[PDB]
Design a protein around this motif. Sequence first.
Motif, PDB file in Angstrom:
ATOM      1  N   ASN A 196       0.857  -1.202   0.000  1.00  0.00           N
ATOM      2  CA  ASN A 196       0.000   0.000   0.000  1.00  0.00           C
ATOM      3  C   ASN A 196       0.900   1.263   0.000  1.00  0.00           C
ATOM      4  O   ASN A 196       1.923   1.277   0.699  1.00  0.00           O
ATOM      5  CB  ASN A 196      -0.910  -0.019   1.248  1.00  0.00           C
ATOM      6  CG  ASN A 196      -2.150   0.866   1.119  1.00  0.00           C
ATOM      7  OD1 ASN A 196      -2.076   2.040   0.750  1.00  0.00           O
ATOM      8  ND2 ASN A 196      -3.300   0.305   1.477  1.00  0.00           N
ATOM      9  N   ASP A 223      -4.866 -12.125   3.607  1.00  0.00           N
ATOM     10  CA  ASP A 223      -6.190 -11.528   3.355  1.00  0.00           C
ATOM     11  C   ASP A 223      -6.952 -11.315   4.697  1.00  0.00           C
ATOM     12  O   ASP A 223      -6.310 -11.121   5.738  1.00  0.00           O
ATOM     13  CB  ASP A 223      -6.979 -12.414   2.370  1.00  0.00           C
ATOM     14  CG  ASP A 223      -7.835 -11.610   1.392  1.00  0.00           C
ATOM     15  OD1 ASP A 223      -8.489 -10.625   1.803  1.00  0.00           O
ATOM     16  OD2 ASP A 223      -7.860 -11.981   0.198  1.00  0.00           O
ATOM     17  N   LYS A 224      -8.294 -11.354   4.673  1.00  0.00           N
ATOM     18  CA  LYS A 224      -9.150 -11.166   5.873  1.00  0.00           C
ATOM     19  C   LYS A 224      -9.038 -12.258   6.957  1.00  0.00           C
ATOM     20  O   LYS A 224      -9.396 -12.020   8.117  1.00  0.00           O
ATOM     21  CB  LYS A 224     -10.618 -10.977   5.465  1.00  0.00           C
ATOM     22  N   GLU A 257      -3.409  -8.514   0.539  1.00  0.00           N
ATOM     23  CA  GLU A 257      -4.743  -8.030   0.151  1.00  0.00           C
ATOM     24  C   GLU A 257      -5.236  -6.947   1.129  1.00  0.00           C
ATOM     25  O   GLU A 257      -4.755  -6.878   2.267  1.00  0.00           O
ATOM     26  CB  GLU A 257      -5.739  -9.191   0.058  1.00  0.00           C
ATOM     27  N   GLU A 258      -6.199  -6.128   0.690  1.00  0.00           N
ATOM     28  CA  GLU A 258      -6.582  -4.867   1.384  1.00  0.00           C
ATOM     29  C   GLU A 258      -7.216  -4.964   2.791  1.00  0.00           C
ATOM     30  O   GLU A 258      -7.229  -3.973   3.534  1.00  0.00           O
ATOM     31  CB  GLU A 258      -7.422  -3.950   0.466  1.00  0.00           C
ATOM     32  CG  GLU A 258      -6.684  -3.357  -0.743  1.00  0.00           C
ATOM     33  CD  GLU A 258      -5.553  -2.387  -0.399  1.00  0.00           C
ATOM     34  OE1 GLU A 258      -5.606  -1.710   0.655  1.00  0.00           O
ATOM     35  OE2 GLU A 258      -4.601  -2.291  -1.204  1.00  0.00           O
ATOM     36  N   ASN A 261      -3.864  -5.037   4.991  1.00  0.00           N
ATOM     37  CA  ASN A 261      -3.141  -3.749   4.884  1.00  0.00           C
ATOM     38  C   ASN A 261      -3.749  -2.647   5.767  1.00  0.00           C
ATOM     39  O   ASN A 261      -3.006  -1.845   6.338  1.00  0.00           O
ATOM     40  CB  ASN A 261      -3.044  -3.259   3.423  1.00  0.00           C
ATOM     41  CG  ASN A 261      -1.888  -3.889   2.650  1.00  0.00           C
ATOM     42  OD1 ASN A 261      -0.801  -4.118   3.188  1.00  0.00           O
ATOM     43  ND2 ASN A 261      -2.119  -4.154   1.367  1.00  0.00           N
ATOM     44  N   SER A 262      -5.084  -2.616   5.872  1.00  0.00           N
ATOM     45  CA  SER A 262      -5.802  -1.679   6.761  1.00  0.00           C
ATOM     46  C   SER A 262      -5.696  -2.028   8.259  1.00  0.00           C
ATOM     47  O   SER A 262      -5.808  -1.137   9.106  1.00  0.00           O
ATOM     48  CB  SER A 262      -7.267  -1.493   6.330  1.00  0.00           C
ATOM     49  OG  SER A 262      -7.958  -2.727   6.257  1.00  0.00           O
TER      50      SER A 262
END
Lengths: 545, 545, 545, 86
Positions: A196, A223-224, A257-258, A261-262
Motif C-alpha cells: 500500500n 487476506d481477511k 490483500e486490502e 493492509n488496513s
Amino acid sequence: SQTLLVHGKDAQGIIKQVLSEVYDAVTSTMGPNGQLVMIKNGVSTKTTKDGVTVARSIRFADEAHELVNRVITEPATKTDEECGDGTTTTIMLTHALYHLFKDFPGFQHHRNIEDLVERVIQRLESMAIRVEVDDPRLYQVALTSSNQDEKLARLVSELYANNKGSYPDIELKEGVNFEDQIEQTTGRTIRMFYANPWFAKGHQGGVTELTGFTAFVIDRRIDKEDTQKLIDGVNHLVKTHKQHLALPILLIARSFEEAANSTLMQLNAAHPTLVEDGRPWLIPLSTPGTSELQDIAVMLNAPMLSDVADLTKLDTHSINGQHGQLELGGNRSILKSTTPKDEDRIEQHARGIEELLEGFSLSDKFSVRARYNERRIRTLRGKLITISVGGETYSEVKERVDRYEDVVKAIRSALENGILPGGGVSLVKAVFGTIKEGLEDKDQSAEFAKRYINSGIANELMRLSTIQHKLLFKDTALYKENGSFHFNDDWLNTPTVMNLATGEIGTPEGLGIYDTAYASITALKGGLQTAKILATTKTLILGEK
Amino acid sequence: SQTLLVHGKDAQGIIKQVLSEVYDAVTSTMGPNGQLVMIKNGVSTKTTKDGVTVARSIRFADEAHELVNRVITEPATKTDEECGDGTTTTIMLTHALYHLFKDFPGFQHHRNIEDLVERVIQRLESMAIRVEVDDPRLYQVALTSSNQDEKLARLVSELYANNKGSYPDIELKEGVNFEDQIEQTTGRTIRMFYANPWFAKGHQGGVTELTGFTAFVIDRRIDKEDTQKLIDGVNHLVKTHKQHLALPILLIARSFEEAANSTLMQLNAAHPTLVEDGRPWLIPLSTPGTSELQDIAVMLNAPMLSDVADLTKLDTHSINGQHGQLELGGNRSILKSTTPKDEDRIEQHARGIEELLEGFSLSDKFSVRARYNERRIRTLRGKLITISVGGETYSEVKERVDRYEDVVKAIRSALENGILPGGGVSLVKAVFGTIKEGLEDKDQSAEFAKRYINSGIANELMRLSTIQHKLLFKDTALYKENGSFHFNDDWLNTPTVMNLATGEIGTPEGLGIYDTAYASITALKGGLQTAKILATTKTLILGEK
Amino acid sequence: SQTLLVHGKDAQGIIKQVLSEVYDAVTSTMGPNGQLVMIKNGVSTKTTKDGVTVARSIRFADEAHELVNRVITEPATKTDEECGDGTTTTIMLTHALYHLFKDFPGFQHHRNIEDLVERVIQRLESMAIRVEVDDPRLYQVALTSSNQDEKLARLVSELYANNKGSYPDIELKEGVNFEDQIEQTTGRTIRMFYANPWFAKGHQGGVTELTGFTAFVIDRRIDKEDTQKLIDGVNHLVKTHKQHLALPILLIARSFEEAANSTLMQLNAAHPTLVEDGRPWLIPLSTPGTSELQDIAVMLNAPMLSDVADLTKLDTHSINGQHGQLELGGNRSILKSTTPKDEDRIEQHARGIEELLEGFSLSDKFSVRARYNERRIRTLRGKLITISVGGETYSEVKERVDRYEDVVKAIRSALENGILPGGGVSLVKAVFGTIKEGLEDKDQSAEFAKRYINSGIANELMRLSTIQHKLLFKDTALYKENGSFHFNDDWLNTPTVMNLATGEIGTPEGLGIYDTAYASITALKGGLQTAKILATTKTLILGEK
Amino acid sequence: ELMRLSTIQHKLLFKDTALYKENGSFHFNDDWLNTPTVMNLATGEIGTPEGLGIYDTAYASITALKGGLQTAKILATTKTLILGEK
Ligand SMILES: Nc1ncnc2c1ncn2[C@@H]1O[C@H](COP(=O)(O)OP(=O)(O)O)[C@@H](O)[C@H]1O
Ligand SMILES: Nc1ncnc2c1ncn2[C@@H]1O[C@H](COP(=O)(O)OP(=O)(O)O)[C@@H](O)[C@H]1O
Ligand SMILES: Nc1ncnc2c1ncn2[C@@H]1O[C@H](COP(=O)(O)OP(=O)(O)O)[C@@H](O)[C@H]1O
C-alpha cells in the motif's frame, strides 16, 4: 462460414497453403541482405526486416487459414520472449521438417523421424562452445546481434570484461543528451515492493531510505483470514522483544490483500511512540518459485516462516535486526551497504545453489529449472549497472534502447550457454555427424541402416540441414562456381561461408559469425513438434459454440 | 486456335500434363495383374491390357496436347515394330528420366545425366545372358510372352529344340480345323517375285514350277532407258551361248518398270522355238541393302552384274545353268532341290557373313547393320516351317495366330540376343552396379563423386530404377512387410520378386521371368532421348501455314 | 465429346450406372407375371415382355454408356442365338456377381471367387436331368416355353413321342388356312446346292429330280487355278470309265467360283451325246467343319478326294454310281429312295460318330465340338417333317411360326441335354450343395474355410443364388408369411415355389416348371466372365482415330 | 450381420497395420476366439490384450452398447422433423 467442419484432403491442402505463405513472407527477411516488409497499422507504415515483427503481425482473411497460422506463429513468437533471437529459423525449419514428415508416411516412420532428429538435437547440445567475459569473441557476438555497431559492442563487452569476477546486471533508461551515461553500483536489486502507498515516507508511495531494519519473511498469501494472526504477532514482538529490534519491522510476504493492509495501518497508529519522522515502523512488502523469497530472507538476516501465527513463537535466536542500508520503492527495493559478515552468508547461500547445478544432467542445464536457479544467483551476487541511453531525437533514443537490450540478451546467453558457428553450418555438421556416428558404430549399424539410411530418411534429412545455408548464400559469390554446392568431407572439416556484411569468404570461426546455442536448439526442438502437429492433423473446426 | 504460339512456363506445364496422363493410362496395364482399358472404334469396344494398343490409340482434344503426345507415343510404338515387346516400360521410364532432368537444371547437369545413364546402358549390354535352342529356359521365355499357354510354348520350343543345327524360319496361316497343323520343309524362302503376271504358267500370275533354269542377277532399276541393252543382251545369249543353257532364263533385278516388261514379252514372241508347254523362257523378277541380291545370286549360281549392257560380254566361265528345282510365285519364289555341290557354295558364303559379325564391336552387335546381316544368314541357311493355326471360331483363330507370332518374335530375339532377369530387377542391379563401379575404382572416383554422387544425381537415379519393381509389386505380399522396401546388399546378391501368375516368392532366375535383352535396352535408350527432348523444349507452334 | 479418356472413380461409376439401368429394364420382364416394355421403331410400337428383344433394343445417349451397354448386352443376345432361351437370367446374374466382385477386392479374392463359382458350375452340370421322347414331362417343358399353349405342346410332343427310334427334324412354312398342316417324310435334308442356275432342269435354277447319279466329293475351293484339273478329270471318266456310270456326274465341293463354273458349262457342251431331256450330265454343288462333306460322301457312295487332280487316278474300286432317287435344289438338295444296302453304310457311319461322344468328358459334352457332331448324326439319321402353320390373319400366322420354333428349340435341347427344376431353385441347391460338399469333406476343409467361408464369400454367394427366387416370388402368396423367407434344410430337401400361371404352391417337379440345362449353365458361365470384366475395368476410351 | 458388426472396433484400430497386412483381411476363426491376438499401438508388438495390458472398464463398453442400441433405434424409426418456432 460456408462449412465449419473440414475433413481430410482439404484440411492438409489448407495447412500446406498457409505454411507456404508464411515461410515466403518471413524467410525473405533472413540475414543482413534480407528484403523488407511494409506493415500498416491504422495510419502508418512500419517497414522492417524483423522476422518476429513480420511473423507476429501477418494476418489472413478466412478463419480457417488463421486458425492454422496461429499454430505456426506463436511458437516462433515464443522463442524471442525467452531467448531473444531465432524465430525465422524456427519457421524455416517448421516448413523443412513438415515437408519431410509428408514424404514418409506410416506411423512407424514418424516415430523414426523423431528419434533421428532427437539424436541430432543432442549432437547440437554437445557441440556447444563456452566463453568467459575476457575472451574477444563476445565482441564479435555483440557485433553480430547489434547489426554492425562498432560503438555499442565495444562498450558492452568492456562492461563485462572489466568486472572479471562479477556478472553485471544491466538496466536501461531513455536519456536526455546526445551522449550516453553510465551509472555503476555495488548493490543488488530485490523484487520486493510496497503493498500500500501509505507505508512509505510522506505516506504516499515515495522512496523511503533506511539505515536500519528488522525483516521477517512470510510465505502465505494474506487476506481477511490473517488479520488476527498479525495483531498477535506484531504486539508480541513490540512488547516482549523490543530491546533487540531496529525499526522498521519489514513484513515481506507473497501478497497483501486490502483487508490485512488496513489492519497494519491501525497497528502503526497503536504505538505512536515508535514513529520517527513520519516513517511507519511496519511495512508490508509483496513479490510476484517459492525459493525467491528464500533469497530475500538470506540477504536481510530475516528468518523463513510458513504461517502468520509463527510470529508469536520467536526468540533472540530467530530475530535478527540489521544495521545496513536499504532503499524501499513502489516498483522494487534496493540494497546497498552490506557488512562483510552478511557477504559471507549470501556467498555461502549462492554456493549452495551452484552445487545443485554442478550435478545436473546436460539436457536439464538448458531447462527452465536451471535458468531460474541462475536468475537466483545473479540476484544474490552481481553488480547493478544503470545505463541512460541518448541520441538526436525521441524515436532514435527509444530504438537505441532496444538495440542495447538485444545486445545484453545476446551477451548474457552467450557466456551462459555458449555459442555455435554461424551461417547455418552447425546444423549441417550435426546432421552429417549424427548419420556418421550411428552408421560407423558396428554395434547397432544393423538396425540404424534399416531404419534411417535404407528407408532414405537420412538422405532427406541431410538435404534439409542445407536449407539455411542455401537461403543465405544462394545467388552470391560462393554458390556461383560449380553449378550448385559440394558438401564433401573437405567442407565438413573446414566449412566455408560468406560474411554478408563484408563480402569476403572464410570460416564462421574466422570471420566472426556466431549464433547462441539456446536459439538454434530451441528452433529445431520447436521446429519438430510444430512440424509434426501440422503433418498429423486431419481436421479443422470453426464453429462458434 | 486461341494462340498458335506457346512459349515458356506454359509449354512445359502442358508437356507435364500430357506426359502425366499417358503414363497413368498405360502404366495401369503393366504386367499380368494390370487393369483394363476399353476403347471405342466407331460402333464397337476393344477392351485390352495391351499397352501398345492403348498407347497407339489414346487421343486428345487440344492440338497442343496431341502435338506432345505424338512425341511420347511414336517411340513406344516404334519398339514393338522391330523388337516385339516393351512399350509400356519405355513410357514409364520416359516419365522417370523426365522428372529427373527437371530436378537438376543447368546445361552441364543434363550432360552429366546423359553420360551416367549411358554407362548404365553399357552395363545392361554386358549383363546380357545367352541361350542355345536345347536349354529349358526358352520354354519359360515362351511361357511368359504367351501369357501362360502351357500348349504353345511346348510346341514352339520343341520346334527349335528338335532342329539343333538349323534355325527354323516360321510362317503362319489361318486354318480350318479345331486342331493345328505343321508343315516342315528343307528349302528356303527367296524374296524374288514376278514383275508382270504374263511371265507365269498360264500367262496370268500363276505358280510356275521348274526343274531347270539359268539365273542372271542385275542391280540397276530398269525402265525405258534399258529396252535396247536387253534386246542386245537376250539375243546375244540365245544366239551365241544356247548350247550351255537350261530354260528358263531368269532375269532377277531391283525393279522392272512397264516399258521394259513389254519389251521382254516380245523377245519371248521373237523365239517361239524355245517355248515348252506355254512357259515363257524369260522371266523378269523384282525384289523390295544391295547385298540381298548377292544372296539371291549365290543360291542360284547366277553371276552379279552392275549394268544391263554387261549381258553381252559373257562366256562359259560366267554363265552357269542350274538343274535343281524352283517354284516361282507372285508373292515370293521358293527353292527346294539343292545338289550338295551348291550347298558347299552357299555354306561358304554364309561363313563369310558370320566372320564379319565375329569381329564386330559389342555395341554394334545390337545395331541394324548386324541384325540385317543375320537376316541374310537365315535366308541362306535354315528350314522353312508352315504352321496352319486353328480353333473353334473365326476371331479366336486370328487371335491365336497373333499369339503364335508373339511367341516366335520372342524366341528368335531370345536366342539371338539373350535374355535378362525379370520383374524390373536387371535395371536396379545395373544402376547400383554402375554407381559402385566408378566410385570403387580409385583412379577416377575423384571426379565421379564430384559429378554424380556429390551433386545428388546418383541417388536420384537409384530411386528411379526401382520404379518398375514398385509398380509391379506395390500392394502385394512382398511389399506388405516392413512399411516399404529395403534394397540392401543382401537383396542385390539374391533379388527376390513375386510371380504374379502364381503368387509365390523367389528369384526371377528361379521362378522363370525373363525379358529380352533388346527390349529393356531399347526402352532405356529410347527413354533417355525422349525424356531429354520433352525436358529441353521451350516452345509449341500450332499454326497451319 | 468433352473428354475421350475416362480413368478411375469415374469409369466404374459409369459402369455401375449403366448396368443398374439395364438390369431394371430387363428384370422387370422376367416370368409370366413380368410387366411390359413399349418400343418405338420409327412410326410404330412393339410392346413386349421378351427380355432379349428389350435387351437388344435398349439404347443410350452418351457414347460412354453405350460403350459399356454393348458389353452387357451382346453376351445375353449370344445365348438365344445358340440355346434359344435365357438372356434375362444372364443379366440378372451379371449384376449379381458384379456387385459381389466389388465387395471383395484384392487380386487374390477375385481368383477365389472364380474357383468357387466354377465348382458351383460343375454341380449344375452334374444335376442335369435326362428325358426320353416317351416321357410326359416333354409336354410340360413344351407347355412352359409355349407360354401356356394347350394345343401346340400336345401336337409337337406327339410328333417326338410317335417316332420312338428316330429324331424328327422339323421345318416351318407360313400357311394359307386357319388350320395347320403336317407333311411327314422318310428322307433327310442335305446342305448341298447349285453353284450356277444353268446346271438345273430348264437351265434356270429349277428343281431337278433324278433317279440315278454318280457323286464325287472334292474338298478344295475351286477357282481359275482348277480349270485344267477339271478338263483332265471329266474327260478321263467320260472316256475311260463310261461303262459303269449313271448320269448325272455330281461334283460336290466347298465353293465353285465363276471361272470354273463356265469351264464345266462347255464340258457339258463337249459331249452332247449324253444330254437327256435338257438335264446337264454334270452339276457342281457348293456347301457352306470339313467332315460335313464326309457325311455328304457317305450318304451318296461318293469317295472323298483332297485334290481336283485326283479325278484322273480312279477305278471301279473307287467309282460307284447310285440308282436311288435325288431332288437337287437352289437352296438345298433332298434324298428320298435309299436301298437297304446304303442304310447299312450310313448307320455304320453314324455309330462311328456316336462312339466318339461316348468317350467324351462330361464338360466337353456341352461344348460346340459335341453339338456339331450331333448335328451330323441327325443329318445322317432322322425324319424330315414339314409343318405349314396357319391362322386367322397375316401377323398371327408369322407370330405362331415363331412360337412353334421356340417349341422345337426347347424340345430338342430338352432331350439332348436334359432339364433342371425351375423357379430359380436349381441354382440355390447347387450353391448350398457346393458349400456343404467342400466344408463337409475332412480332407481340404482346412483351406476351404480359409478361402471361402472365413473370408465371407460363401455367405455372400448363398444370398446371391436367391435372387432369381426373390424376383419371381417377392410380393406374392409364398413370401407374405414370416416377413421374408427361410431357406432352411427342410426347404433344400423339398423346395417349394409358386406357379405364376395358376397360383398354386408346390415343388417345381410337382407343378411342371423346368429350365433347359444348357441355358442356366450358360447364363452362369456367361454371368461370371462378363461380371469380372466390368469389375476389373478401369478405363474408357471414346476417341475416333 | 451382428457378427460382422462386433468386428468394427477391431477393424478401426488395426486396419492398416502389421496384424491386418498378412492374408488380405482377417480370419476370425475358433482359434482366434480362444486366444485373441491384438496389436499394442504404443509399442508395436503383437499378443493378447491380457498379455500386453490393454483393458477397458466394464461399465463403459456396456453403457456404450446399451446406449448405442436405443439411440440407433431412435434414429432408424424416426420419420419426421419439425423446425417451427411456435
Ligand atoms: N553478417 C553475417 N554474415 C553471415 N551470416 C550471417 C550474418 N548475420 C547473420 N548471419 C546468419 O543469418 C541468420 C540471421 O538471421 P536473423 O533474421 O537474425 O535470425 P532470427 O530472426 O531467426 O534470429 C543466422 O542464422 C546467421 O548464421
Ligand atoms: N508372370 C510374371 N511374374 C512376374 N513379373 C512379370 C510376369 N510377367 C511379366 N512380368 C514383369 O512385368 C513386365 C511385363 O509388362 P508388359 O505389359 O508385358 O510389358 P511391355 O508391354 O512393355 O512389353 C515385365 O517387365 C516383366 O518383368
Ligand atoms: N409358369 C411359371 N411358374 C413358375 N415359374 C416360372 C413359370 N414360367 C417361368 N418361370 C420361371 O421364370 C423364369 C422365366 O423367365 P424368361 O423371361 O422366360 O427367361 P429368359 O428370358 O431368361 O429365358 C425361369 O427362370 C423360370 O424358372
